[PDB]
Amino acid sequence: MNTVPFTSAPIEVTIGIDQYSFNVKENQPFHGIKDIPIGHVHVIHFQHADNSSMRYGYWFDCRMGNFYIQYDPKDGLYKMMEERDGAKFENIVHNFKERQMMVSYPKIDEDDTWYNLTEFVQMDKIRKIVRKDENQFSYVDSSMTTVQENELSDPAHSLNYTVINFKSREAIRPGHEMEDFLDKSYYLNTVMLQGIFKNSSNYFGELQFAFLNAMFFGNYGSSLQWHAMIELICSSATVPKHMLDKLDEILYYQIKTLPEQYSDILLNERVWNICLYSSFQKNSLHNTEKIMENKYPELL
Amino acid sequence: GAMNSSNYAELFNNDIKLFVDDTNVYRVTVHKTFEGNVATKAINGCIFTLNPKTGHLFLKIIHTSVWAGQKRLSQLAKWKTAEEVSALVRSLPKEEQPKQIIVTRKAMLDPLEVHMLDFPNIAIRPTELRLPFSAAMSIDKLSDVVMKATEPQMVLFNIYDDWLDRISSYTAFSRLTLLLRALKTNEESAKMILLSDPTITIKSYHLWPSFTDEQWITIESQMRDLILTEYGRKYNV
Ligand SMILES: O=C(O)c1ccc(C(F)F)cc1
């Protein structure tokens, strides 16, 4: 298990770590989060108490570097930093872990939720969507736009998700206009999976990362991307059987984790009704259909 | 976006545009079978593609052979229409290609948009106007070429005959829509109005009779009376 220590916590803030959250009071003796499970990506996130504007946070993997958080009072936010040298870092942290002022990552032993939400997510692929090569961790916030949103404005501060557009020449082969528009299999299997993603694991990783950025930051472009990637599969008549069974598992845990009270803003009624009741795969997502009907029957 | 009664003069400006009406593409008769079931029989159809400024009508005749062995024909018909309009645009010299294509039915928007992705500068638009172009097959010379066709064919007409020598395209379109609305509402009475007088004939190279300016006023009045008459009969007014 690894630790993200804090220099201090000078402003009152709600801190998220993966699907957990806790409040820190202005100048409370908080020195970070400890017992973070090795083996998974993680996200540490923030929403200031005095200004719920800009949710922001950092995607990291403790296997890649020694990471701490210090509040920068000029830019007004908690920043992730990297200590390159292990001995210096180990000396500062053990002090605080002896003085007991860290929240323990509260992993229940039965619980596979975080693994189920990040099964296909890798730091290396995160760092390609979020471009800032000099850090091993990736900053994301509420207001960051995606490359597709920019085409429809700073490109350095953007989320470089794979663009999906059903009415684009990339999606439609000349001579196959009706075929490719009504059955997205070409676009899914040849353009996206064979061409861009190389395999379904990479496609699912981006889908999972988009969902998590929508849920944890309220990032609108991320929500758009998550739904586009779902609709592309459901709108394809020809999908490998293992991909459909894994999608059902991925979506089930996403719907299970979504706060009930954010359903009006995180779920697109049109896409979900199309996917579950009209699409080619309307009968291929049994676990997701069952949780959706029992948890959010209003949306349907 | 959509085209309506506010921006109606736009139809007659100098930006090339085309209306596309797909109503008469897929046409059938419905009949009982020997076993007492019901069957359809397709008949020849057409795409109605019109430049409202010039009167140029690109009538693409849809021969029943294009449906053979195909499924979901009502859906296919929209995509076949889009395919054929796309092919027409590509066949026209650049300086003749439309800047806008207005579809009379919103179901044609996605099919035409997808077939025209190669032409991102051609706007594909719906319209709030209720246009009576489904009645084109009430024009005898158009109906005749469609039903006689034994193979796919494209035929070019001017649907305004020579009217633009004497009237504006705004007035020509208004006359056309009044004539077609009357033919749609009561075809027999409309043709009686148009053909009752043998001293007025249809030139071999025209679709409508050779009415003088004052005679067109009379005919137009009789058409409006027909429409009002049928309205009264329909709603018991
Ligand atoms: O530079 C470091 O390695 C360093 C400095 C300050 C803290 C604080 F968070 F505990 C942690 C690490």
Swiss-Prot record, chain A:
Predominant location category: cytoplasm
Cellular component annotations (GO), alphabetically ordered: cytoplasm; U5 snRNP
InterPro entries associated with the record: AAR2, AAR2_C, AAR2_C_sf, Aar2_N, AAR2_N_sf
Modified residues (Phosphothreonine): T257
Post-translational modification: Phosphorylated on serine and tyrosine residues.
Keyword vocabulary terms for this entry: Cytoplasm, mRNA processing, mRNA splicing, Nucleus, Phosphoprotein
GO biological process, one term: spliceosomal tri-snRNP complex assembly
Similarity field: Belongs to the AAR2 family.
Quaternary structure and interacting proteins, as annotated: Heterodimer. Interacts with PRP8 (via RNase H homology domain and MPN domain), competing with BRR2 for the same binding site. Component of a U5 snRNP complex that contains at least the U5 snRNA, PRP8, SNU114, AAR2, SMB1, SMD1, SMD2, SMD3, SME1, SMX2 and SMX3, but is not a component of the U4/U6-U5 tri-snRNP complex.
Protein name: A1 cistron-splicing factor AAR2
Curated annotation (Swiss-Prot), chain B:
Outcome following mutation: D21A: Alters protein folding. Severely impaired growth. Strongly reduced growth at 35 degrees Celsius
Result when mutating T23A: Reduced growth at 30 degrees Celsius. Strongly reduced growth at 16 degrees Celsius
Subcellular location: Nucleus
Record field: transmembrane: none
Effect on the protein upon substituting D22N: Reduced growth at 30 degrees Celsius. Strongly reduced growth at 16 degrees Celsius
Superkingdom, taxonomy of origin: Eukaryota
Region RNase H homology domain, residue ranges: 7-237
Job description of the protein: Functions as a scaffold that mediates the ordered assembly of spliceosomal proteins and snRNAs. Required for association of BRR2 with the spliceosomal U5 snRNP, and the subsequent assembly of the U4/U6-U5 tri-snRNP complex. Functions as a scaffold that positions spliceosomal U2, U5 and U6 snRNAs at splice sites on pre-mRNA substrates, so that splicing can occur. Interacts with both the 5' and the 3' splice site, as well as the branch region. Has a role in branch site-3' splice site selection. Associates with the branch site-3' splice 3'-exon region. Also has a role in cell cycle.
Additional information: Present with 468 molecules/cell in log phase SD medium.
Domain remarks in the Swiss-Prot or TrEMBL record: The MPN (JAB/Mov34) domain has structural similarity with deubiquitinating enzymes, but lacks the residues that would bind the catalytic metal ion. Contains a region with structural similarity to reverse transcriptase, presenting the classical thumb, fingers and palm architecture, but lacks enzyme activity, since the essential metal-binding residues are not conserved.
Binding partners and assembly: Component of the U4/U6-U5 tri-snRNP complex composed of the U4, U6 and U5 snRNAs and at least PRP3, PRP4, PRP6, PRP8, PRP18, PRP31, PRP38, SNU13, SNU23, SNU66, SNU114, SPP381, SMB1, SMD1, SMD2, SMD3, SMX2, SMX3, LSM2, LSM3, LSM4, LSM5, LSM6, LSM7, LSM8, BRR2 and DIB1.
Protein name, UniProt field: Pre-mRNA-splicing factor 8
Protein source organism: Saccharomyces cerevisiae (strain ATCC 204508 / S288c)
Full protein stretch here: 1836 to 2069 of 2413
